[PDB]
């Protein structure tokens, strides 16, 4: 699905077309913004520390592990998504890449089956 690339400060560098469809923000709008704009509180207010923490401690909590989290669209609606984060480097600087898998349908089908 969506692909997002951020620098070591959480600023969006690349935003794929699928990402635009999934999150509602366009490439130009998202580029130059903190990745925290795609998530809700409390994570939103702590995400920077999350990244900050990893840069010194070097202890992966998600990198190479993957996790299902809640994403937030521009219109404020939240949805579940699987996220895998990869670490890379360019220009001697660190970059993080996130691969997103929308699980909205999976969750809806599950809730519906649970309801019937
Ligand atoms: C939109 C939803 C997202 C949410 C809610 C989210 C949530 C989190 C959480 C909970 C942590 C801390 C994990 C822990 O303390 O165990 C974390 C760490 C991190 N996130 Fe995200 N994140 C999101 C998107 C992204 C994206 C798109 C990127 C990068 C392209 C990113 C990069 C990072 C990095 C680099 C870390 C630290 C590395 C690590 O702990 O393994 N996150 N995130």
Nearest protein Cα to ligand 1, atom 7: 43
What lies within 8 Å, CB to CB, of 6 at 6+ separation is: 12, 13, 35, 95, 96, 98
Angstrom resolution of this structure:
2.0
Integer angstrom CA distances of residue 105 from 10, 64, 69, 97:
28, 25, 15, 24
d(CA 101, CA 18): 10
Both tokens assigned to 64: 């190479």
Atom of ligand 1 nearest to the CA of 44: 5
Annotated binding site for heme: 47
Q: Write out the H or E segment, with its range, that includes residue 29.
A: helix 27-30
Residues pairing with 3 in the sheet: 99
Task: Give the method of determination.
Answer: X-ray
Dihedral sign from CA coordinates of 41, 74, 50, 66: positive
Atom of ligand 1 nearest to the CA of 87: 35
**Topology of 1-116 in CATH?**
Beta-Lactamase (3.30.450)
CA 37 vs. chain centroid, Å, equals: 9
- Residue extents of the structural domains in the chain: 1-116
């Amino acid at each position: 699905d969506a692909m997002i690339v951020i620098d070591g400060h959480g600023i969006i560098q690349l935003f794929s077309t699928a990402a635009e469809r999934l999150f509602g923000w366009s490439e130009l709008e998202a580029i130059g913004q903190n990745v925290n704009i795609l998530m809700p509180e409390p994570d939103r207010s702590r995400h920077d520390s999350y990244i900050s923490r990893y840069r010194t401690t070097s202890d992966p909590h998600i990198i190479g592990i993957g996790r299902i989290v809640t994403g937030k669209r521009r219109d404020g609606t939240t949805f579940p998504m699987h996220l895998s984060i990869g670490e890379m480097q360019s220009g001697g600087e660190p970059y993080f890449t996130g691969f997103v898998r929308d699980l909205t349908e999976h969750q809806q089908t599950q809730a519906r089956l649970q309801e019937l």
